[PDB]
Symmetry: D2
Subunit: 482 residues, 4 copies
């Protein structure tokens, strides 16, 4: 066959499906996945087209982080034409994909200085380096916000051409554009990829059927590694992906109003963030908690919903307090164990992977789609996506020392973001007594690999058995690659 199967019906699967169908009208492109989209990140995303807004001091302090940021800047440049090309297969009545053009980043004191002050400076620096249109503005000039004075921002940063989409209208427009270009939707799940003599044959589905193909693209979010790793000798060659459980909410505003821009903070403790994405029809999206879980989870915790609502009502708009909760949304950000995406070719001919995009995969989608389509066509794709090839040794983007400083900082930030009220001696006490146990965990896990902070905290508070299983995993990966 020259037949192509895309495994997964999130934004990444459908984006790659659309680019393949449009570029090869000769070939049959079939996309698998069910309308339920169980643990789907895409439906739970607002979503922000985050590039400059996603900048942290920590990210920009590694080579691997500066490459990710560069790819996000490149992805930003594709969004206007990509949206035009998707709305062109529909009519006015289908709804607009774009919900805002611009973003305001707010700096308030409801957080750690060591994250929020460092990250605001890093965002300003990255905007100036990339010659992006932006302005530091008076907080008084930010429309709509009505924070608690004790939670108010004292600095604000307007970013032009960094906006948001309605993730639901984007999915509808992707499906529509996929069908329009000759794509076929088969609403079942893949259970197994079949390959022999180093070549893909096709995909077994969960109804027992077998679909033949010479090209399989895996974009099954957090299930992508488990699916490819079953193939011979790949178990320790594809980096593990965990579930980044994220909570968000849809709220009908007291008066039907909403902001004209995205409103956000910089990224906060363990990739949690506060943002408000505008929506049509008197709705706003608020997000977003993040927690790496070693097993999948389909429901918000009490703590996640309380923290999200408390931050939005104090830091963005007190009017949200009396506003109607329409929906609490939960999705799994695919969380790669080495903190970097899995994009491109495998050692198996015709087998491609598009996954581990964590908290910015929706934003990257048009760039990642174009990259994989160029590779499949004999091209080189996008420069700088080379380090993120799916079949690799675990990347070490930071020293153990840098990560141990980060995990303690982020731990303390869970306190300052609450915000807590404690005796002034207690924070220094906890900083000192956290360092030892995290240093001991990092040394015990592996001599060579260190999990990034988001994952290290989940491991710190996991069962002894789960820690032991990870020591074994890290050891098997060292054997395979050294």
């Amino acid at each position: 066959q020259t037949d192509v199967i895309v495994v997964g019906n999130g934004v990444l699967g459908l984006s790659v499906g659309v680019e393949i169908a449009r570029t090869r009208p000769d070939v049959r492109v079939t996309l698998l996945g069910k309308p339920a989209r169980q643990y789907g990140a895409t439906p739970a995303a607002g979503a922000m087209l985050g590039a400059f807004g996603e900048v942290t001091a920590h990210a920009l302090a590694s080579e691997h982080g500066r490459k990710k940021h560069a790819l996000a800047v490149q992805a930003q440049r594709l969004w206007p034409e990509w949206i035009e090309s998707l709305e062109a297969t529909g009519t006015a009545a289908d709804g607009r994909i774009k919900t805002a053009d611009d973003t305001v980043v707010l700096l308030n004191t409801v957080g750690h200085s060591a994250l929020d002050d460092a990250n605001f400076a890093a965002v300003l620096t990255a905007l100036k380096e990339a010659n992006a249109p932006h302005e530091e503005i008076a907080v008084e000039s930010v429309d709509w916000i009505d924070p608690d004075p004790n939670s108010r921002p004292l600095r604000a940063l307007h970013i032009e051409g960094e906006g948001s989409v309605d993730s639901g209208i984007l999915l509808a427009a992707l499906e529509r554009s996929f069908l329009q270009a000759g794509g076929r939707l088969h609403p079942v799940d893949a259970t197994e990829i079949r390959a022999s003599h180093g070549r893909v044959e096709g995909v077994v589905t969960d109804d027992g059927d077998f679909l033949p193909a010479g090209h399989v693209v895996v974009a099954a979010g957090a299930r992508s590694q488990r699916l490819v790793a079953a193939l011979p000798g790949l178990a320790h060659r594809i980096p593990r992906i965990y579930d980044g459980v994220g909570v968000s909410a849809l709220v009908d505003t007291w008066d039907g109003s909403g902001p004209a821009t995205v409103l956000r903070t910089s990224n906060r403790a363990f990739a949690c963030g506060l943002h408000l994405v505008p929506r049509a029809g008197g709705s706003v999206y608020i997000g977003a908690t993040n927690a790496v879980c070693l097993e999948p989870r389909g429901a918000a915790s009490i703590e996640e919903t309380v923290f999200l609502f408390n931050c939005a009502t104090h830091q963005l708009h007190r009017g949200l307090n009396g506003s109607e909760l329409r929906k609490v949304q939960v999705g799994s950000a695919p969380a790669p164990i080495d903190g970097f995406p899995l994009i491109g070719g495998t050692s198996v001919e015709g087998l491609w992977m598009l996954s581990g995009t964590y908290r910015d995969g929706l934003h990257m989608s048009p760039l990642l789609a174009r990259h994989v389509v160029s590779l499949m066509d004999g091209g080189t794709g996008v420069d700088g996506l080379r380090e993120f090839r799916p079949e690799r040794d675990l990347i070490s983007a930071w020293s153990r020392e840098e990560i141990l400083d980060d995990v303690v900082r982020h731990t303390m930030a869970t306190g300052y973001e609450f915000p807590w009220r404690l005796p002034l001696e207690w924070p220094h006490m906890m900083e000192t007594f956290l360092q030892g146990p995290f240093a001991e965990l990092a040394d015990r896990l592996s001599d060579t690999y260190t999990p990034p902070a988001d994952l290290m905290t989940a491991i710190m508070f996991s069962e002894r058995e789960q820690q032991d299983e990870l020591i074994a995993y890290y050891a098997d990966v060292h054997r395979e690659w050294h």
Copy 2:
């Protein structure tokens, strides 16, 4: 031919008792499976009698009568449950979720409510010779509060428990069908009557159903439906929406308490409680807010307040537990604070509504009462004051209500709990008294809304206040 309008616990309870007692007569029950604004699905629910006692309630004749009826209702529940589970099988689930209740006293609230109400509960238990014990907090199973939010006193009440409201509704429907009842899943738009007699009910699909008996148990919609009939607009007390929020939570470890865990009733009939459920679930409730217009969704504030209280005052483990569902229902909130139970001036027209925050518990007693009246009996003796066609009851002086509304307002602060400069509470007490006194005087020379409704009126639009002055004036004309 009997038509019951409404498919809540009250409608179905009366439907079941009619169908079982008069196999001769044809009983049709209206209402849709969606149960829009339905209180019953959002209730835990507690079989609250002693737990529902407040100092304020026990200080009026009307309050002492309500409490006595709640004690009487408690005695019916064991046989009523047995009679409803008997029409089903093991796989249908158990209606009863706990036999006993623990009342906790903590400092996350106003002394003027929580301390007074705990004493009142203890007093009422001793007066009724009810089996109970003040116990050491250390001996309360399961709870794991924040030390700063922990209880220092606890009260075990035997034979005051809880039901799964969802399994009760399923068992009522099933028992109704089994006794010959007919479920027609549409809403009533209009009651038809002429020459002082009910003819039947127009449905929202355009149809007309004839009957010589109509029982209105449509919760918070009950008055709006009967008040359309000639000269009844100012003879049936208004019912508003007591919007209540609760939640279903899957516990971190699948565990749950063996008893109900609760505080006494708090600001504006809000309360904190945990009702056990089967299958590693717990129910937590319950906020209350009187709204002049219906509302079908929880506010952010309601969800945050409910979750914050449960995680700090009951169990910190609930913080990491999975939210399965946020529930919203309308407690039917009668403008004079008392239920609407019994006959009208229109022959064959009965009303069963305005049961606010205890209607589920009362349901078997209220059902038996209305069925006895329909059969030519006298029903239950002290339900007489609550006949639906009446002048607005005045159970409290204006002065008592103005003290209550200021106390409850201050309690919204202490229940948060707030942290403010120590001069600010006394400042707010002084500056709240004037505006509430001015509102009560402006509303009517004779009627005073109870606190729960007065705060909703205080913060409503000028037009909504003016419409209520007109309503109160028209009721004075009609009855004096």
Copy 3:
């Protein structure tokens, strides 16, 4: 006699004493007052040489306020030579009057946006209009501060040539400079001013003695009016002066360190402010609460000490938490009932008044001294200080409406400055329910006069009898002047 008696040994008394003795070597100048300085504002002041730092939006919005600011800029220009002239009468071991040259103004969210944001903008505006040397700086570049992250500043403003003095070393240097110029210190209190046929004869002291003079200058701070008002028909001709009771503290720092600049916020609720003034020898000054009292009070309340210490440890330096409290200081800022100073001549020949300087009298002292000395010598003194003649109808600088908005704003600010944690509906509730009672008090007090906000809140929470006595006072003043 040509003899001069100065009644009062605060900065104003001693400053005028020094300027009289130096300008008229012919005349005998005697200065009364005890070393205890009971209710003395001067010893309790840090003190800041505030000009740009004292700017508020409210001040810059009136003609009266723009004049006060201009006088403060003029006073600033006198301080270098005035200090040189006072240190010249001493030796190396006497210590330095000047403790800092520069001031950093900090903006944090531990307060009302309606005061702190407006006042920070007003300071920046006034600096730019005057072309005064200043820089908005990164908070990270502010030396020494170590705030609680949740209480930290996000903006900072360096003002060159706006500094501080040790008020205690200034008093010692003024006494010494007074003696050096021929002055006589008589350490007793005046009980009575004696006058007949419209001329001063002298002063009865509290030891029973009588001192004759043809010139008496009253600079007795908050006691100044009570002393002159006892003279015939003057009870309702000299505006009342109340006690602005202010609390500050001297702290020995954990490590002997201190900041090189003044550190301050803009003025806050009811003229409270948060500041740290450097001192020699491992000490710092922290201030300063303000509360108008209708009766004098010589001791700090619990609330004042807790509020002062809580603000300094959270907003300036957590190290102050473990630092040793050396002294709690209480002084009476002389609070004139119409909000303007009492400077110059009376209807009684040879009777002068120098008082009602509230919260800036130390900074103004060299200008106010020179002004009164020029008037006594037949000159015109400083232009624009003529409006503040002590014998006057109560000035009305603000509409009743402006004052009622101010008092409600400042009342709400006591909450945000705490800072309080409240349900989000409660602040709007309190704003609404405060308006009525303050409007009712203003109407009941007088048809013509309105007390400024700082005094109105003290009257609101005073006894019924004290309110009634003020209605009578305001009525008697209307009779006297209309």
Copy 4:
């Protein structure tokens, strides 16, 4: 006559001085110490005559603790006659020593359940076992208190015949009674005790003089050991006494009122406690913080004053917020390194010690005085005070394991007593991460001795040099006694 010198003018010195002068008309008794009473615990104490009020679960669980409680009950029986005998040397105008007969113990949730709930139960148990007159009462029936509802007590306990004295009037009555019985007050400090051939010769004073005597009693509070340890080979034979630095305050109440009983909580984190002791003349005493310091400190920290005032205004009476602060008091509770007093004879003939009474020495004073005076006369004194002889190996009353559990519990209690507001996961996190570092400190300090919790926390947060000096001290004590 034979010469006796008492070194120290606290309650213990003067109590022993009074009993010697009255009992031994043969001997000439001179008592040293200045009216300043530098670091004096006695002037800073309220003070409560604590017996049942001082009971904790920890105390009642050891033989040593049940003995201390029994001695406190015995001391209580002496107070009525002792007061009668001291007031008899004065007149009506000298003031009453006794300020209350009864005590109310309050239980609120502003603290750790593991201390406050356990201690309230232990007090109730001890009262019932002794058949002591007491009643658990309704909180509504407690006179005077007006707490913040969120900080209010939910249980209260009236104890009859457990009261309080004005420590200042007790000191004045002791001095007066000492003079009346033939005692001599020499207001200077001892610098050195002189001894040769194993016998005391006398005392060198800080004015250079030498006073001869055959009997010297050291009751210099926290200076007692430093003074005796200078004598040959005694540096490691007399257990070190550190400074239990305690802060209290005198407050003039808003309305001149006060409670008729002592109002207290049980003892809280590191022997801090909250109490109100009635005083004459519209004053109340509030206390009392406690912190073991390795060096003396004569001034309150900001933290201590804020914590004391915050607890009293919220938990006892909101009226104290607007009340006038008259005095912040600091004293050194003599804190023995092994947690037991130093009472009786040394290896040096005529050298006695009466010290290390920490937080209950004022209550014990008449019993301890009678004991030492009986020993000096050839008697046996009080049975069970013999084990507290000053020249001893450090006592080990508690396992290392018991102390490590206590220090973690008390550390957590500093949080709950604040009270803090934190995310709900944080307290369990802090409990886990505190255990290791305290266990590591205890192991490193000595193989044999473990400091009690109050001292262990001070050592944990001391300088490396101070920890090393204590390892050396503990090692030298092991050498000396094994």
